[PDB]
Paper text:
The process is initiated by the mitochondrial core ISC complex, which synthesizes a [2Fe-2S] cluster de novo from cysteine-derived sulfur and ferrous iron (Fe2+). This complex is composed of the iron-sulfur scaffold protein ISCU2, the dimeric pyridoxal phosphate (PLP)-dependent cysteine desulfurase subcomplex NFS1-ISD11-ACP1, the allosteric regulator frataxin (FXN), and the electron donor ferredoxin-2 (FDX2), which is itself reduced by the NADPH-dependent ferredoxin reductase (FDXR). The sulfane sulfur (S0) of the persulfide on ISCU2 is reduced to sulfide (S2-) by FDX2 to initiate [2Fe-2S] cluster formation. FDX2 and FXN compete for binding to overlapping sites at the core ISC complex during de novo [2Fe-2S] cluster biosynthesis.
Second, a sample was prepared in exactly the same manner, but was incubated on ice and contained equimolar amounts of FXN and reduced FDX2 (hence abbreviated (NIAUXF)2). Cysteine was added (‘turnover’ conditions), and the sample was quickly vitrified, resulting in an incubation time of less than 1 min at ≤ 4 °C. This condition allows persulfidation of ISCU2 but only slow [2Fe-2S] cluster synthesis. For the turnover dataset, heterogeneity at the FDX2 binding site could be separated into three major classes. The major proportion corresponds to FDX2 bound in the distal conformation (65%) and only 14% of the particles show FDX2 in the proximal conformation. Additional weak density at this site, typically associated with conformational and/or compositional heterogeneity in cryo-EM, was further assessed by C2 symmetry expansion and focused 3D classification. This revealed two major FDX2 conformations that we refer to as ‘proximal’ and ‘distal’ according to the distances between the [2Fe-2S] cluster of FDX2 and the FeS cluster assembly site of ISCU2, namely 23 Å for the distal conformation and 14 Å for the proximal conformation. In the distal conformation, the [2Fe-2S] cluster of FDX2 is too far for efficient electron transfer to the ISCU2 FeS cluster assembly site (23 Å), whereas the movement to the proximal binding position brings the [2Fe-2S] cluster to a distance of 14 Å that would allow rapid electron transfer for reduction of the Cys138ISCU2 persulfide. When bound in the proximal position, the C terminus of FDX2 is ordered and well resolved, interacting extensively with the NFS1 subunit. Contact is mediated by hydrogen bonds (H-bonds) between Asn175FDX2 and Cys-loop Ser385NFS1, a salt bridge between Asp179FDX2 and Arg393NFS1 and hydrophobic interactions of Phe176FDX2 and Val178FDX2 with Leu160NFS1. When FDX2 is bound in the distal conformation, Cys69ISCU2 is shifted away from the ISCU2 FeS cluster assembly site, whereas it is facing towards the iron, but too far for coordination (3.9 Å) when FDX2 is bound in the proximal conformation.
Residue numbers in the entry:
A (entry chain D), B (entry chain H): 35 to 157
C (entry chain A): 56 to 455
D (entry chain E): 56 to 447
E (entry chain B), F (entry chain F): 5 to 85
G (entry chain I): 69 to 186
H (entry chain C), I (entry chain G): 3 to 76
The structure:
Amino acid sequence: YHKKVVDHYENPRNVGSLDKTSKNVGTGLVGAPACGDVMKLQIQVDEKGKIVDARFKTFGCGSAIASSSLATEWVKGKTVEEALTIKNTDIAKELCLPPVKLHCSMLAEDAIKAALADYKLKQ
Amino acid sequence: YHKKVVDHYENPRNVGSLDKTSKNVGTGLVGAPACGDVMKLQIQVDEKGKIVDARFKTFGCGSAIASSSLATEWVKGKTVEEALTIKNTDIAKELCLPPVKLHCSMLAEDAIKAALADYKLKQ
Amino acid sequence: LRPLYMDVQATTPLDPRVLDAMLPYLINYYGNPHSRTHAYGWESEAAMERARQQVASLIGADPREIIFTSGATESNNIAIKGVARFYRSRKKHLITTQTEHKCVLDSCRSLEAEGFQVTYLPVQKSGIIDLKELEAAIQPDTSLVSVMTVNNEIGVKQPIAEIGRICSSRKVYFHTDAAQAVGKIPLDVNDMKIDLMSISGHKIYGPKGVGAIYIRRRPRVRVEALQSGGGQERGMRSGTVPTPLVVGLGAACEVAQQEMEYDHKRISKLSERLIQNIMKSLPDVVMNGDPKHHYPGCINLSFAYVEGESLLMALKDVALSSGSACTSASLEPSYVLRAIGTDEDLAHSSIRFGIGRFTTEEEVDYTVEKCIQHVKRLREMSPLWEMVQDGIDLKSIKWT
Amino acid sequence: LRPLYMDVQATTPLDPRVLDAMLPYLINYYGNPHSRTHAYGWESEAAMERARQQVASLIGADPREIIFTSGATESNNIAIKGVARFYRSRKKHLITTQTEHKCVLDSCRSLEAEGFQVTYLPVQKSGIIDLKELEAAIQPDTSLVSVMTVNNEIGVKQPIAEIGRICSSRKVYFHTDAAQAVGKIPLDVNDMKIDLMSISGHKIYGPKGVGAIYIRRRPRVRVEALQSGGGQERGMRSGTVPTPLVVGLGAACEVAQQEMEYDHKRISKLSERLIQNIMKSLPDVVMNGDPKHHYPGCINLSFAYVEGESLLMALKDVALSSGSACTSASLEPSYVLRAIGTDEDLAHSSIRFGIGRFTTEEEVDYTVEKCIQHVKRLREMSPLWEMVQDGI
Amino acid sequence: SRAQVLALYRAMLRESKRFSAYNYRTYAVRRIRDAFRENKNVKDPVEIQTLVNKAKRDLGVIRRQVHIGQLYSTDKLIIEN
Amino acid sequence: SRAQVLALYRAMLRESKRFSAYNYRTYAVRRIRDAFRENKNVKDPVEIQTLVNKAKRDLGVIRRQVHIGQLYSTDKLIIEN
Amino acid sequence: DVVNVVFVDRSGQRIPVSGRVGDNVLHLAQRHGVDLEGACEASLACSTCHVYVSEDHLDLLPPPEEREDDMLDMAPLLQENSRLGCQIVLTPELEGAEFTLPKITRNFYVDGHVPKPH
Amino acid sequence: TIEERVKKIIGEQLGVKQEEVTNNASFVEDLGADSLDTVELVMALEEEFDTEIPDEEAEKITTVQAAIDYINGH
Amino acid sequence: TIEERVKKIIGEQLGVKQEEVTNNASFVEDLGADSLDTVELVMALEEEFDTEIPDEEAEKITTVQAAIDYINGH
Ligand SMILES: *P(=O)(O)OCC(C)(C)[C@@H](O)C(=O)NCCC(=O)NCCSC(=O)CCCCCCCCCCC
Ligand SMILES: *P(=O)(O)OCC(C)(C)[C@@H](O)C(=O)NCCC(=O)NCCSC(=O)CCCCCCCCCCC
Ligand code: FES
Ligand SMILES: [Fe+2]
Ligand SMILES: [Fe+2]
């Protein structure tokens, strides 16, 4: 395993849940198509529009868990439009994912988009 | 590499030749069909029709040399009729020849028969 | 510090007695066993025949019925392809199961590409085939029936004797893949009515790169050789015989024949300990395969709501295996777990534990404690576990 | 007391450095190289990649072009049968020589039974093929040309570079059986235009039961797998890769690369010593092959009017080999000696001496002394010698 | 033969706790104990002598394998800490 | 470094003369002699250090192989008589 | 910018598909209900997007890269007209191209399993 | 304490709950141990208190008092 | 005796005809030998006359007379 994936797996960042019934909380629950990987990503957006909290729960491999932790710690501090500019290519390049583990970065990007879309739908 | 074959090869009996012009000497020079083994066997008979001396010269494998030397020492001391009863099966049984080595005993029997036939033809 | 080894199904450590037997032929007796003219060849041949007798004595066969190969993969290839190609003029149908090893399955697929007909028998939820289904699947042009003795993934045991009885009654050649069974459970080729058997050297604490195949001589079973050459191994397997490897295989067979009863009792006790300790501390843990016809040395457990490779990564101090698709080089799901009827999510949650000759109670307890702690953590991280606690019942997930 | 081993062609003794490299993986590192989730598997895989790089560095190839097998027999089977079966739909003709190893010949004979056309090229009296003959034998539907680099019976070398040039000009795949040439003579796959190469472990002082095959990747050469399974070794050979055996093969390749020049000079000196001392004392002794294109470590001599197996039995304290039909389980004569044009009674009189890395001048002198003594004795016993003396 | 058996058993245990590898060391020790207690009640002196000869052969094998493993030693297992 | 090279050469020769096998003993002695003679006029200290390190590794390999061959020893060759 | 390509499945059905310039063969076949696995989803890791290309258009495709070739080494039933479907991009010279689905892929489905579309 | 460690060793090697091992209890009669068990107890005492007990003293070591006296002497 | 064994060994180890080995002949100046050859001569002397020459004494051994004196004394 890569040392960065090992670090994000052994010390996962922002693991938890948020009140999904809140007006200012978007929930994205996605699943990988070719494997059983499942990611649940949630965000908290303040009155400014800047993400102040992110948290994930992931059923999947260590690469998927690392991708979810990294995706949470990346959209933390950004805005909606900036969070929309986060690509699975960026996640995979940062984590040095081999070609068989790119589904993890794809699922992380899908979960970010799903959470953002849910927040936009309720707002 | 059976003990009797080794003994008969390392201490061959009656290596040499007899005079071919003598009336009481028969020479049998015969070869093997499937290989290059060649035996030359010569015998000496007396007034009473008793084989008193025999010699051999063999171009062939160790088993063929052992068969030829056994044939010489077996033929010495017998008559033409008794030497006509020496079969290849007896030589093979005495030397414990494996199935691939029966050509040696066959060719030794052929040499014995050729020598007896040459002697009686000279007579 | 090195991790504990609990992956004996993948391979086993070399037995010190086997290595002690092998070393003289790696140092001094380096002659070619097929050299017929000198003492190096003679002594190599004598050692090879001794090893052949040892293997035959282990499996209850005649020494002349043992052919040395490079492994159980080559043994399975030789058996299946040689029988099918030799009896091609009249027999064009083959029978095997859906839970067979990849070598057997790929040989059957390649034969299908060659014009043969292959029936892949389904298995029950216990992992055991149905004898009525096998009898109904047998055709008048059936050539070979191939059923493995012990499954390498779930460890279930097939009714080899009954299958052999049926095949003998129907005049069909019976082949069994006993790579996971030789030296671990009793095997008798004559009592089980086995025509062909596959043996792996490194599954019985022997050296890697060596194997054997049993071919019945009365009534004679014929195969068409796959490796062409000088006609070694009675013409079924050409090439130089690796004398140190075959000596090691024979030594391993003798050691297994001497130690089978003790090893089985020790492994049964250890497996019972591990299974009860895991089940009494972790809820929602199921065992894949029926315990009544299970070899205790191969334990497959599904940890619900925890992914297999994530659990493997958490257990970095224990060498294990998983059936998850994320552990595969081509994202291949576990076809054995699919065949036995496991759900997809539970199949992604399977962990294989291996207990062998050198496993200790200390290692088992350490593995159990680590498993309990890390499964609790990963379930606390699990959205599926949270969903089941809430009651959503996993109905709606965006799979994109 | 044990006899002297001069049979390096049949098999070589294990090098102590090869055994020292192997033992750690026979003792502590016993994991499966194809295990993808634990340290045992990772370290075994790292060792196997290291060995692959070692073999590729020896033969001047890329590591990804090396496939580990169980020996040169399996390598030859894979090359010939896989190439022929992959390019079946258009190419139905194969070319090989009359003095090839039995594995290559039997693969070609089994392919003939499969509906292929095979041409067996004859050799000159020197044991070398004719390039004009090969050029004329190449057809528009020719799949593969197989010529061994060094003959295992007489030790003659073939014009491998010229054959590769011809094959690339004619757009035909070139396979060479180098099981007697790796680590003994310089080999370069890119400079000889070689598409497939066979390598044997126990012929280069490595362990038995392991081998390698080189398959060119640029331009890509495809083969059809003969061993089905889980698709290891890039899908070209299934089954578990034996880690101790492949580490041993790689170590042997490294040692051969480091020692080839020393070994060649030493073997060459020992070879002329042996040949000159035999030919200066025994009349009617001829060499089988051509000295100008000969590897000195494989010496095949014919002792006229003396049978080969009888000479071998007289030489009980020297381990040697012969081409006689009495040394064969099926009374088979030496087809190589027949092909090169040797008369039958001299083909029955051939002895193959072998000089290797561990051969000593003392052993060479002892063998020469014993050979002279026992050939003199057997010639005194020979009726053919008697007849030649009598002018018949 | 009691003294000879007890000396052989002591030598076997002493040599077995010299194994560099955890698996081999533990297995050899436990196997020697189990076998010696298994054959505690044998009465036939020929069987006793056969067992003692087998034990001598196994002790020689253990000596050779222990020294070879010491020559090629690796790190310790995680549980050995 | 002369003294170090002379001590290492002496140790290599002494250890190689203890091989139990004729081929290994003779090859090791001849190779050590020939290699030290071939590398006699080297001037680069880096190259000399590399040769010394390689010789140390070779001496370790020789020690292990000699003692393993002593553990597993066979009959002497006919010419050793 | 319309490209018409025919898909031939395992049973021999001839499926006509109206693609577009710049389209991907795997995505197009999965959009039109063609049972092409494509497990890795154009990641060059599974080689289950294996397809047979008609001889009239095989030479018209960009030559395969070294990674595509390495990955094709792992595909069973390999032929001389074999390409990875995830690496083929539709172009106007591929009019009438026909892609034949092999009988088996790298992943074992001897029970007749059909992976859900990816 | 040396004798405390000796008693701990005997209790661990015999499974006697660390209560009946007194300064006069024998390994064979009072406690449950045969010749094979005694061989192991002596080797474990050698393991803990680093020493190499000769056979002469090993045959003498039959009681906890004997083991304690030998260890305190050496 | 001994000193003829010494001369004989020096002769077969420096390949010198077995006439230039004199009681005052030096190993490096008179005879033809370098440091590596001297290491071999000392080892051959050790092998014939069973002993273990220390490093200081081996360094002192530079002449046939020195080797003679050492072998006589030891
Ligand atoms: P103690 O109270 O005097 O009693 C102990 C003994 C056994 C000495 C006593 O009960 C006795 O005299 N019994 C008579 C029977 C007997 O002496 N049998 C012992 C035979 S020796 C034996 O058991 C050999 C077992 C083989 C050991 C090899 C283990 C394998 C190791 C290989 C691992 C790599
Ligand atoms: P003297 O004045 O001491 O002269 C001797 C030396 C060589 C020390 C002197 O000539 C010198 O100073 N030369 C300079 C170069 C030098 O020191 N070279 C020596 C380097 S060490 C060397 O040559 C390593 C060779 C390795 C031998 C291993 C071969 C064994 C193979 C294994 C067999 C199984
Ligand atoms: S989809 Fe896996 S390689 Fe094309
Ligand atoms: Fe995953
Ligand atoms: Fe013959």
